[PDB]
């Protein structure tokens, strides 16, 4: 233990040149991959926008062509999963996480096309899912693909290129380089023992990917919130309160996502036909709801600015919350390819804004702006459900850019992570791999 | 066989640890704050004392020198006499403490480092408050471990980490950078640990609050909102990174080699040392008048450099002079970190690169200020080899998130070439040198 560390402190931060180059290509692929995926989802959402114009007079035929249009796409996605790669439903992050524990295989030859085209369908129909799921897993696999294609020996290479794939994947999903990197080191690392994940590699991966994303989808931000106001010290306690709320609600949400997977399993039994049909029913509901109420359906990256600015009434907020809790469960819990991250940012935004609303009229002394409580609460559901606060907090900070709110955000985050623990809750991405592994063995 | 242990009990820190974290941070906070006020106070005295002799010029250069000299000596002594393990930064010492290869003699170090650095920093030496606050912080974390008798490797390693964290935070008003420091660098990265990240947060939060209760409403670095970085411009940051990458190990040599050359001067003799100390400390307070830019923490020339208010000449000069004064202050065991002086070195070098780039590429519509900010944490990348920590540290202090891609690039570019030109994490090379004299 003694001479071991001595001198061997050299060979800290000594990543093999081969791995570093391979990370560069991994990122570059995950980049373009993510970009192409993202353009695809846009194009398809737009077709359905154009198709709703060929039927903009006949109102009941519109409600139809919206539903059926999202329905057909959902079904196509649900199918492409159930038929060719079952392990590519849901987010797929717990699958990538298992792959780091070598408890799950990375069937890239399958998942890549399945997740890509698969999600490209669920997201396309305007389902309440995030592009993270796809790009993080697609990313992770793209990392394994290049491992194989180049035959790279060692636990270092395998784990590193898999991580840096998952990283560049999350990065390209949010244009959030740091968030990507931090995702790995804070959370995505096999946190039961040490790893051979070279952080310098993750970097290069993330860099390349982020550039690839910026070569195309740039000059415009995913979330524009403008520079919100500051947060006076005598105001910080209000964020610890909001945190606690997220902390009690965090596990409650984690139950529903889990329990809902169960309840929805019955409806189809595991039957690839009842499933794909149940899928297109939800996917259809989404494209329909994405018209009659757009704020109840879709990624959620739209109501974020509109909520932060406080353009929603307290009523419309409470409604959007309930509706989105519902539509988020229906889309994620039901195996549809697509992450739960983005929907969680919206839910947190919306709830933070609601808290802000109330806080504003209870404390005119404090000179509050609900918009700061929105931004503090934005990554707060990610803290009490994913239990990855530092990741969400930097994710938010990279997207909303209001660093003056770092103290309040860190507090709401920690406040959420703490109460999520003490109320008896568990990292959602861990409780999901805990199940798919438990169900796997209990099936022997 | 039991192929399970599964997943629940991830992020399950014992309530006791979490509460103790809160207290650790609060202490490290106030401690940091008090330390900070002290250094200010003392710099101020020497500022006032330079007024009682503002007419007689040669008597001024004397009252500056001797003034910093006396304070330097006080600090160097407080170390060599009561706690030798509290010289230099003290980060390598806190790192060893996580590997259980160094002891945390808090009863000694706390007062030694506090008052010790309070002297070296006070005299206007080229050292950062991090050294003190990080170590002081780390020890404060162990003090409360003992005083409350906490069993387990978890509690020991956690409260020690969150102390060093809250310590770095309070030193820069950089909560994220604090947390990142542990997770990115400060974790014993040879195996897994029981460092509870949830605790580190609590510690850092409390500390940061404590810092903001007092030293707030004003920033350590104000740079304003710099311009943006067009994609066709990024290559210039990879170049700058490479430069920091080649220079990184070269600087790492000198810091190390200079510790050696300066050891001879005193032999290890606590009198020739304390005297040679007050010689440099005296040189500093003297230099901190005849040219303030070559002496002190460096948080002053940062804004003045980023704005490009220095000529190309005055930059190269400031660089050389600060390379010299930085080594003399750190390599010579004086209590006080090397982080801050590295930020200034990087700022200054980045600005110089920016200067050139600006007149080589009018097409790119450059502003040297962006290359300054990219370069700021670049020496921290090529020497400490902790780029994620430095990048977030700069980003938290300078607040130009639009420059994140360019910063990440310069950073990586430095970390890469530091490796390939054969260099090593300086805070590891120092713990390695200290453990290689314990065994060899």
């Amino acid at each position, epitope marked *: 233990r003694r001479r071991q560390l001595i001198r061997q402190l050299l060979e800290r931060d000594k990543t093999p040149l081969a791995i570093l180059f391979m990370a560069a290509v991994v990122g570059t692929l995950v980049g373009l991959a993510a970009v192409a995926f993202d353009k695809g989802v846009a194009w398809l959402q737009n077709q359905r926008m154009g198709a709703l114009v060929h039927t903009a007079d006949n109102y009941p035929l519109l409600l139809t062509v919206a539903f059926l249009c999202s329905a057909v796409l959902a079904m196509f996605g649900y199918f492409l999963v159930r038929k060719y790669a079952p392990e590519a439903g849901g987010s797929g992050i717990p699958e990538i996480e298992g792959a780091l524990e070598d408890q799950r295989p990375v069937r890239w030859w399958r998942v890549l096309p399945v997740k890509f085209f698969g999600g490209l369908g669920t997201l396309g129909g305007g389902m309440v899912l995030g592009r993270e799921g796809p790009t993080v897993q697609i990313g992770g696999n793209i990392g394994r693909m290049v491992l194989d294609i180049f035959r790279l020996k060692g636990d270092e290479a395998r784990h590193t290129l898999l991580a840096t794939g998952a990283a560049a994947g999350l990065a390209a999903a949010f244009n959030a380089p740091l968030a990507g990197i931090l995702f790995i080191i804070e959370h995505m690392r096999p946190q039961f023992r040490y790893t051979l994940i070279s952080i310098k590699a993750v970097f290069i991966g993330v860099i390349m990917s982020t550039i690839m994303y910026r070569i195309f989808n740039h000059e415009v931000a995913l979330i524009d919130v403008g520079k919100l*106001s500051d947060a*006076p*010290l*005598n*105001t910080l306690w209000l964020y610890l309160i909001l945190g606690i709320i997220f902390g009690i609600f965090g596990p409650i949400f984690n139950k529903w996502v889990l329990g809902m997977q169960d309840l929805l399993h019955r409806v189809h039994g595991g039957n690839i036909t009842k499933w794909v049909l149940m899928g297109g029913a939800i996917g259809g509901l989404c494209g329909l709801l994405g018209f009659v109420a757009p704020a109840t359906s879709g990624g959620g990256f739209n109501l974020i600015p509109i909520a932060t600015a*406080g353009n929603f009434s307290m009523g419309m907020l409470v409604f959007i919350f309930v509706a989105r809790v519902i539509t988020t469960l229906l889309c994620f819990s039901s195996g549809a390819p697509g992450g739960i991250f983005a929907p969680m940012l919206a839910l947190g935004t919306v709830l933070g804004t609601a808290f802000g609303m109330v806080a*504003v009229e209870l*404390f*005119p*002394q*404090y*000179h509050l*702006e609900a918009g700061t409580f929105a931004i503090a609460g934005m990554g707060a559901l990610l803290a009490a459900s994913i239990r990855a606060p530092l990741t969400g907090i930097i994710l938010v900070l990279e997207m909303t850019d209001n660093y003056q709110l770092i103290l309040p955000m860190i507090i709401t985050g920690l406040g959420a992570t703490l109460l999520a623990q003490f109320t008896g809750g568990k990292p959602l991405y861990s409780a999901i791999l805990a199940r798919t592994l438990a169900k796997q063995e209990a099936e022997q | 066989r039991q192929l399970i242990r599964q997943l629940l009990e991830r992020d399950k820190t014992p309530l006791a640890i979490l509460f103790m974290a809160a207290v650790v941070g609060t202490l490290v906070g106030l401690a940091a704050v008090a330390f900070d006020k002290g250094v200010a106070w003392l710099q101020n005295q020497r500022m006032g004392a330079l007024v009682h002799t503002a007419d007689n010029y040669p008597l001024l250069l004397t009252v500056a020198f001797l003034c910093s000299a006396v304070l330097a000596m006080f600090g160097y002594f407080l170390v060599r006499k009561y706690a030798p393990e509290a010289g230099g930064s003290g980060i390598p010492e806190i790192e060893g403490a996580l590997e259980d290869q160094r002891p945390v003699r808090w009863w000694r170090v706390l007062p030694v480092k506090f008052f010790g650095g309070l002297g070296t920093l006070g005299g206007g030496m080229v050292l950062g408050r991090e050294g003190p606050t990080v170590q002081i912080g780390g020890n404060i974390g162990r003090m409360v471990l003992d005083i409350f008798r906490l069993k387990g490797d978890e509690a020991r390693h956690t409260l020690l980490a969150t102390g060093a964290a809250a310590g770095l935070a309070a030193a820069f008003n950089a909560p994220l950078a604090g947390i990142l420091f542990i997770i990115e660098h400060m974790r014993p990265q040879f195996r897994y640990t029981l460092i509870s990240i949830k605790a580190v947060f609590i510690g850092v939060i409390m500390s940061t609050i404590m810092y903001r*209760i007092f030293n707030h*409403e004003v920033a350590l670095i104000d740079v304003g909102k710099l311009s943006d970085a067009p994609l066709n411009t990024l290559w210039l940051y990879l170049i700058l990174g490479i430069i920091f990458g080649i220079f990184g190990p070269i600087f790492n040599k000198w810091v190390l080699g200079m510790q050696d050359l300066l050891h001879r001067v005193h032999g290890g003799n606590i009198t020739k040392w304390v005297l040679m100390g007050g010689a440099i400390g005296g040189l500093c307070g003297l230099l901190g008048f005849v040219a303030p830019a070559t002496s002190g923490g460096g948080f002053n020339l940062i804004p003045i450099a980023t704005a490009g208010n220095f000529s190309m000449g005055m930059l190269v000069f400031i660089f050389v002079a600060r390379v010299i004064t930085t080594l003399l202050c750190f390599s010579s065991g004086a209590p006080g970190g090397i982080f801050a002086p590295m930020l200034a070195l990087g700022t200054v070098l980045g600005t110089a690169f920016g200067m050139v780039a600006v007149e080589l590429f009018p097409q790119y519509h450059l502003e040297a200020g962006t290359f300054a900010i990219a370069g700021m944490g670049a020496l921290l990348a090529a020497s400490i080899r902790a780029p994620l920590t430095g990048i977030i540290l700069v980003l938290e202090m300078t607040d130009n998130y639009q420059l994140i891609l360019p910063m990440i690039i310069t950073g990586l570019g430095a970390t890469l070439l530091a490796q390939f030109t054969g260099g090593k994490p300086l805070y590891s090379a120092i713990l390695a040198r200290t453990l290689a004299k314990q065994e060899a």
Partner: antibody
Amino acid sequence: VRLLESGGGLVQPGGSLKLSCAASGFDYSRYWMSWVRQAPGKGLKWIGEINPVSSTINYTPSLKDKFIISRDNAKDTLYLQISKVRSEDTALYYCARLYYGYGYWYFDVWGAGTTVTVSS
Amino acid sequence: DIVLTQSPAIMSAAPGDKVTMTCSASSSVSYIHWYQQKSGTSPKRWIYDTSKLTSGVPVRFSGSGSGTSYSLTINTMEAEDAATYYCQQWSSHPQTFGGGTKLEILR
């Protein structure tokens, strides 16, 4: 940093006026603005405030629509409208830039004033 | 609605005296602020959050107190120290000033 309020003077009871306050030496957006008046003899009394994005305007427990605080950030200027004037409204009127320390808000920088005499 | 009242309505003291006013509130106050007004000029921020000198305020002034009674204070009062001192809270809403204390050069 100079605040320059104008627009006060002689008004007949029951009339109206538009006190103006023009900002300079600082980013007039970013700040909460305020009106405080001092009735001769008497003491200091706060009328109201308005934030940068005009999304909040608070007045004193003054009765139903007496004052109308508004701001135009484009000209960097704060307005006060007093309608149905009285003897009571005869005072020196100050605009003030609002700030804080620990977050217990204070009246940061004031202007010279404008005097409003209300009489027949 | 919170009401603040200052102890000396008017008062006098000789250059280099220990001047000490008061601000007492009907209910609970936190971190009050002090404004100095000279005749024919805009009020100026003097002390804030119970007791913090503003950027130019000479070091002889000082605040203190809590809960229900605070105090401005002068060690070695000056000539230019004569004016009206208005305390003011915002601990509660709406905010409120005090009566004022006129400090005057006793000759």
